[PDB]
Amino acid sequence: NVTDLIAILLFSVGMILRLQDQPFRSDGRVIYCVNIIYWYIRLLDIFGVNKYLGPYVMMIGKMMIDMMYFVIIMLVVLMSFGVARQAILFPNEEPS
């Protein structure tokens, strides 16, 4: 319900931006697409009523914590390789 109200405030911001002229209309459109992402996940919660889909959804929510720890370890290894590759292959770079 609080994610619902956050995505209604976001829709209000997107509508207020869209009802003006350019370049704010495209910004309102960009907000509309993030809203469509949220409403598909709200459809996942609506699937939560079914006797098999519901436990599946909270099972996914339980494995998010293990996913986060995997993300942390992958983040350390990923920036180590990325910084090493970018720092070797591009020696003369300006701050950007």
Which residues are at the interface with a second copy (CB under 8 A)?
A: 23, 26-27, 29-30, 32-34, 36-37, 40-41, 43-44, 47, 52-53, 56-57, 59-60, 63-64, 67, 69-73, 76-77, 79-81, 83-84, 87-88, 91
CA distances (Å), origin 61, targets 55, 67, 72, 78? 10, 10, 17, 25
Contact pattern from residue 33 through residue 62 relative to ligand A1AIA, giving x for each residue in contact according to CB under 6 A and a dash for the rest: ---------x---x----------------
Q: Are 28 and 15 in contact (CB under 8 A)?
A: yes
Q: Give contact residues for ligand Y01 (rule: CB under 6 A).
A: 37, 41, 44, 57-58, 60-62, 64, 71, 74-75, 77-78, 80-81, 84, 95-96
CB half-sphere exposure, 79, CA atoms < 13 A: 5
Per CB under 6 A, residues contacting ligand A1AIA are: 4, 42, 46
